[PDB]
Design a protein around this ligand. Structure first.
Ligand SMILES: Nc1ncnc2c1ncn2[C@@H]1O[C@H](COP(=O)(O)OP(=O)(O)OP(=O)(O)O)[C@@H](O)[C@H]1O
Ligand SMILES: [Mg+2]
Lengths: 49, 96, 98, 88, 202, 51, 97, 217, 146
């Protein structure tokens, strides 16, 4: 502390809800299966960074 | 005599009038500048009644004087706009 | 003591330089982050907030901090597994700071 | 009285019929309505007096002034005027 | 001066001390009144209506209920209900208060002036018919309300009695602006003349 | 035939040094202060008028 | 092209063209639009104010009569400059430098 | 816990972060035993769809709706209210919306949240629709405006006033001659504003000098 | 036939729709795989939209203002269909106009800016002074050679 009182540790464990948010940002750049259920992929991913 | 002349575009340029986009920009900058240097001058007269002139010059920034700086700024702009109004009016009456 | 200009052939002090001069170049690219924004993020929405709070927020609002009474935000250490952009985290924020 | 009403109403009307100009400035007789017109230099056209013509007549006199160049002041004179005060 | 009254009294909502102090009930009302005057529509929204503290206090004092009504109806552009609200605000809030007894008359004038301003800006022309009906008064009444504020030069508007319209002629052009500017320089030219001369003698 | 093609005096940089040395006159036209350009503006009207 | 050239005014009414060319007022507009299209003249076409206000005269054959016009118009211009010059000498006679 | 963070965000006018919470909340209540938690699940389903209406997405409405269970195990009046309002919005049609909430009023009355965000949605579409009409015209009749939007005249006029004070096209309305003129021109010049600061300062300064120069007196 | 068609559309013209339609009805409309098919009857209908957009572009440039009453006549459209066509072509950002609903005018102009006008004026004065400066040299040249 005082050098560095703020310390942010970044996980990769994440949350289900966290993965939905990464997808959206991507989707703005290039839509991934916009006529099919995206949400399967979210469930299936479970370690992914 | 040869050196002094630099064509006929020496004198033609006195009539020549720039973009008025530029004039407005120069005059804008100068307006703000005088406010910002007026504040600098306000600090100069914050009190400025303590002894010895030399110690005041260093303390209230009388070296690199804000009063002199205001004066120059005003005069360049005042005189420039004087010539611009004059050359414009010259142009109106002369051509048509 | 700071950098200053000297004439080439008169070898004297004729002119002054900012001290900023004659010091490290500041971002060797262009300063800001490429088209990558909070939209592109995709993280880490919360922790990115914590980075905004730390870096941009005091700099934009000084007065706000003065109200709490605290000294302004201390250094940040970004550690974790990679592929977290942690480097991109700083660039994104800094973009928006001005 | 009939005079003062006549100088004022140049700025107040553009025309009156012969009945209405009588009533307003108080003329007593029909002939008096037209006689006072010639003297204040309003024409009668179609039984109507026009104050607008007096307006114009006043305007031509201003232009026959030789006083008016320096008084109104050319744009070119004004800029010169400001310039030279400093140069003193 | 209500400008300094609104800056202190709206801030003091958010962290308010009643240790050897007065009630929050008087201060939330007194704060709303002075905010209504000074703040413009945009900041009215921020600091009065969307104030979380004022929200939470809800309607529990008749005073509070009276001034709350009045700001909302000014904001949402309603005119029918503004005219009876104004009357109630005066009766139940301004008068009982000792300190706003003194500013009671000013509140009524300005409040009408403020609701007119919004309407006059937004329209080039009105009818005397439509304006009157909208506030919820008549043609005979509206003509008197307007004869107070227009000769003082607040609203910058005329009423065509002959046509039946309320015409708008608020200058926003350079001419309006030049007039403001020369009033600042003319107070300068006089003040130089007195300070300059005075030193010249002694 | 001999057609007119635009010309102007502009000076080299190495030339310049001497041009500065030999000009020690006040310069009636040099584009200076308020004074210098009020003299110019008049000069300019008679220039054009003769052309 | 000829009438706006010889006149000093550089905006021409529709009624002027209608009498000269012996055509309806309808037919006149048409003529103007076609002149803009060719590059015979260029400028703005105002139907409401019934103008054509030109910005370009495409260069024409120059006969002795047109030189006479061009020469005349520049005598007035030379006189205009000269009169302004006499005024410019009167104000500021006392100080120049 | 998740749902309540959802409601709060939805209201802060962020609809991505909101959406993920209501998604979780839908899944929680489907996976618990349904005795009272279908009810709570149906309510949440309205809120997931509601997030996306505000973002103006009907693709991701297609993805979330399904005939497997979100229209056959949660087939309800709120579903029919949502895909009417969703469809209306994209068309850019206020008319359609207006008619959709007449027969689905009970959805605004029962749901606080649905109502806050449909109030906003109304205002948003009317504002949008207007800009398009008044761009290529000036001196357009107020009556004309009413034809296209599909509202009473008197309504149109009160609505448009607000949006002059809102200050996104700021013109003036003619009640008596029934025109709208659009003004979009600058309302000050830069040199005049910078002048105001300048003469203001000099006013102060001269007083300050005299304070120092009154030693003569 | 093709040659007159291409030429018409390239160069800037004012033309009226039932007279152009009458020219190319026994010519182009009976040529199959263009206009003579069935769903190319609605590519013929489309030819009209392209003609009335051509007239709108031309008239936009050359006419600074024109009454709406007039503009209707020249385009061969009804009042209602004129306004909607102006509007669509202003969304697509090519042209700019202000159309009155009382139907007094259409002002095909985007209202010109203060700075640009002044800029435009200052340049013209420099062209007059340059023009005279060059002329004087060529007077000297001609007199002496004579
Ligand atoms: N939140 C995000 N949304 C979008 N793209 C992202 C995001 N996070 C990371 N990425 C992508 O992954 C890349 C790798 O991230 P970054 O370069 O910041 O790594 P790091 O964690 O700092 O590693 P090291 O340990 O090497 O410093 C980014 O350049 C970006 O393309
Ligand atoms: Mg890194």
């Amino acid at each position: 502390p005082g050098r560095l009182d703020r310390k942010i540790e970044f996980p990769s464990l994440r949350d289900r809800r966290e993965r939905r948010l990464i997808f959206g940002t991507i989707a703005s750049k290039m839509s991934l299966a916009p006529e099919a259920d995206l949400d399967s992929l979210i469930i299936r991913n479970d370690s992914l960074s | 005599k040869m050196l002094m002349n630099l064509h006929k575009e020496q004198w033609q340029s006195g009539l020549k009038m720039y973009d008025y986009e530029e004039k407005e920009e120069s005059n804008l900058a100068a307006t703000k500048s005088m406010v910002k240097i007026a504040e600098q001058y306000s600090k100069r007269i914050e009190e400025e009644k303590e002894l010895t002139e030399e110690e005041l010059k260093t303390r209230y920034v009388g070296r690199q004087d804000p009063k002199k700086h205001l004066s120059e700024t005003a005069d360049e702009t005042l005189e420039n706009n004087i010539v611009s109004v004059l050359t414009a009016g010259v142009n109106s009456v002369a051509i048509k | 003591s700071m950098s200053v200009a000297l004439h080439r052939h008169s070898n004297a002090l004729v002119d002054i330089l900012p001290p900023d001069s004659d010091s490290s170049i500041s971002v060797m690219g262009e300063n800001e982050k490429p088209d990558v924004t909070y939209a592109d993020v995709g993280g880490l929405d919360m922790q990115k907030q914590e980075i905004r709070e730390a870096v941009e927020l005091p700099l934009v609002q000084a007065d706000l901090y003065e109200q709490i009474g605290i000294d302004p935000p201390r250094g940040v250490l970004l550690y974790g597994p990679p592929g977290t952009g942690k480097t991109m985290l700083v660039k994104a924020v800094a973009n928006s700071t001005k | 009285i009939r005079d003062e009403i006549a100088k004022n109403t140049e700025l107040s009307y553009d025309f009156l019929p012969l009945s209405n100009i009588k009533a307003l400035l108080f003329f007593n007789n029909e002939k008096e309505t037209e006689k006072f017109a010639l003297e204040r230099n309003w024409p009668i056209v179609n039984s109507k007096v026009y104050f607008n013509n007096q307006s114009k007549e006043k305007a031509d006199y201003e232009d026959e002034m030789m006083h008016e160049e320096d008084q109104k002041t050319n744009i070119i004179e004004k800029a010169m005027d400001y310039a030279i005060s400093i140069e003193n | 001066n209500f400008k300094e009254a609104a800056k202190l009294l709206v801030d003091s909502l958010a962290t308010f001390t009643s240790i050897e102090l007065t009630s929050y009930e008087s201060i939330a009302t007194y704060a709303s009144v002075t905010g209504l005057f000074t703040l413009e529509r945009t900041d009215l929204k921020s600091k009065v209506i969307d104030s979380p503290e004022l929200l939470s206090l809800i309607s529990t004092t008749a005073a509070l209920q009276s001034i709350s009504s009045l700001t909302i109806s000014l904001y949402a552009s309603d005119y029918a209900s503004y005219f009876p609200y104004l009357l109630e605000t005066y009766a139940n809030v301004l008068i009982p208060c000792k300190y706003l007894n003194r500013h009671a008359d000013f509140f009524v004038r300005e409040m009408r002036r403020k609701v007119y301003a919004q309407l006059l800006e937004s329209y080039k022309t009105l009818s005397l018919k439509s304006m009157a009906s909208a506030f919820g008064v008549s043609v005979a009444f509206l003509d008197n309300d307007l004869g107070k504020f227009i000769p003082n030069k607040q609203l910058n508007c005329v009423i065509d009695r002959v046509n039946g319209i309320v015409e708008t002629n608020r200058p926003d052009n350079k001419n309006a602006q030049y007039h403001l500017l020369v009033k600042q320089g003319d107070g300068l030219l006089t003040k130089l003349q007195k300070y300059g001369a005075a030193v010249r003698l002694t | 035939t001999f057609l007119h093609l635009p010309c102007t005096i502009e000076a080299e940089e190495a030339e310049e040094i001497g041009v500065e040395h030999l000009l020690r006159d006040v310069r009636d036209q040099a584009a200076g202060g308020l004074s210098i350009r009020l003299t110019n503006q008049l000069k300019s009207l008679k220039g054009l008028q003769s052309k | 092209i000829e009438t706006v050239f010889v006149k000093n005014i550089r905006m021409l009414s529709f009624e002027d063209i209608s009498k000269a060319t012996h055509l309806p007022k309808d037919n006149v507009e048409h003529l103007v639009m076609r002149a803009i299209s060719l590059g015979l003249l260029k400028g703005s076409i105002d139907q409401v104010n019934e103008l054509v206000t030109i910005s370009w005269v495409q260069p024409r054959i120059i006969s002795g009569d047109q030189i006479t016009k061009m020469k005349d118009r520049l005598v007035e211009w030379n006189d205009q400059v000269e009169k302004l010059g006499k005024k410019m000498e009167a104000r500021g006679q006392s100080i120049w430098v | 816990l998740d749902l309540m963070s959802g409601i709060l965000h939805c209201e802060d006018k962020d609809y991505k972060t909101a959406f993920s919470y209501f998604f979780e909340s839908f899944e929680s209540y489907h996976n618990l035993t349904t005795h009272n938690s279908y009810e709570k699940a149906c309510q949440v389903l309205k809120y997931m769809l509601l997030s996306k209406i505000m973002l103006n997405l009907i693709d991701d409405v297609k993805n979330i709706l399904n005939a497997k269970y979100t229209k056959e195990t949660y087939q309800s009046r709120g579903i029919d209210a949502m895909k009417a309002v969703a469809e209306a919005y994209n068309n850019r049609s206020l008319l359609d919306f207006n008619t959709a909430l007449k027969q689905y009023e009970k959805e605004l009355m029962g749901d606080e949240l649905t109502r806050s965000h449909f109030n906003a949605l109304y205002d948003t579409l009317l504002e949008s629709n207007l800009c398009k009409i008044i761009e290529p015209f000036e001196c357009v009749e107020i009556s004309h405006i009413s034809k296209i939007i599909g509202l009473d005249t008197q309504q149109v006029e009160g609505k448009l006033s607000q949006m002059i004070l809102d200050k996104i096209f700021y013109g003036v309305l003619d009640q008596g001659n029934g025109w709208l003129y659009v003004y979009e021109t600058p309302n000050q010049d830069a040199t005049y504003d910078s002048a105001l600061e300048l003469v203001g300062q000099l006013n102060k300064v001269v007083d300050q000098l005299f304070e120092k120069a009154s030693v003569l007196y | 036939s093709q040659e007159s068609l291409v030429k018409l559309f390239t160069t800037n013209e004012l033309m009226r729709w039932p007279i152009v339609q009458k020219t190319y009805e026994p010519v182009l409309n009976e040529d199959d795989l263009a206009f003579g098919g069935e769903a190319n009857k609605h590519h013929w209908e489309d030819l009209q939209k392209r003609v009335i957009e051509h007239n709108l572009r031309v008239i936009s440039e050359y006419y600074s203002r024109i009454t709406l009453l007039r503009l209707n006549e020249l385009l061969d459209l009804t009042e209602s269909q004129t306004e909607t066509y102006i509007s669509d072509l202003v969304n697509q950002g090519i042209i700019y106009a202000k159309v009155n609903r009382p139907a007094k005018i259409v002002n095909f102009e985007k209202p010109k800016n203060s700075s640009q006008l002044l800029n435009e004026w200052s340049h013209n004065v420099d062209e007059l002074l340059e023009h005279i400066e060059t002329i004087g040299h060529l007077i000297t040249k001609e007199e002496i050679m004579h």
